[PDB]
């Protein structure tokens, strides 16, 4: 009697909370599909600004290396230097001293 | 260095954030799964009171229809009963 | 090589082995929509499907109760008939018997 | 045999959506291994990174000390120069004298 009543309303009312179950699933997956891209993007540009970062350093040592074998190389040129003036150094003193 | 950090953090919550959306995604299809179920359910229920209906309303209708046979029998008795006796006279 | 070109080769491994995952994955992904959508359009037929058979059970419980209430009211005709036809024989019945 | 006939079809259409149910199930549990091997392998190349940054900027701190002390010792070196320079000017203005 009634409960066949209450049979039948239960099965349209439970269709339609189905079908709405369906399109909320459905928007928030759409959601969830934009929020992946978004990741994705951010996700490169981080990948791109790591590797420029990684050649900034190689590039960086690289200048300091350079800079330091001009410095050594000049060094080894002073020490020349220093050597003959400390030999006239030596001449000049013992002359003098006499 | 500072848009390295800046960045990373970002990526880092756009992950969360996705995560969080993607997992209410999946208690939406499970409660989604669970109402197609109970409407399984209901449906075979449906089935069986149908076709219980289907079958009284033929039995009803075949016993209205053998009584109007059983009277229709009568008539033709008494028919012949009334053609006889109107011989008679 | 030294470390940039030592762990830029570690690092583009891992790299590329993370990128043949996430393509994986994607591939997968794209199937189970496919998948889902299948599903969703044989759910949808087995719905039509179920809405012919009870329309059809409703029609088939229609016509039967149409037949039946055919018969019942040729039967009440059929009892009046009894009636008139069993008065007939009485009344024969005593006119041959006078 | 009306009833076999409408229970043939439905039956036979409600086994094919099983069927469709069983192999997107599958499928389902495969994106969630193939998700879960993305994401270990995610994480590994964030330590990785983090360990070729502390790397890098361990090279570029030691090149810079290299660098600096070898622009110290050049200029103690020509400090030295322009000492033993006057001190050959003086001796020669002593002899001069």
Do not use: W
């Not at 929020?35 to 190689?58: C, I, M, N, P, Y």
């Not at 960086?60 to 003036?85: C, F, H, P, S, W």
Request: include cysteine.
């Amino acid at each position: 009697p009634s409960v066949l009543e209450v049979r039948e309303k239960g099965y349209e009312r439970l269709k339609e909370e189905l079908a709405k179950a369906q399109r909320e699933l459905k928007l928030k997956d759409e959601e969830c599909e934009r929020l992946s891209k978004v990741r994705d993007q951010l996700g490169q540009e981080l990948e791109e600004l790591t590797a420029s970062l990684f050649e900034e350093a190689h590039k960086m040592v690289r200048e300091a290396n350079i800079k330091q074998a001009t410095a050594e190389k000049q060094l080894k040129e002073a020490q020349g230097k220093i050597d003959v003036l400390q030999a006239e150094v030596a001449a000049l003193k013992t002359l003098v001293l006499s």
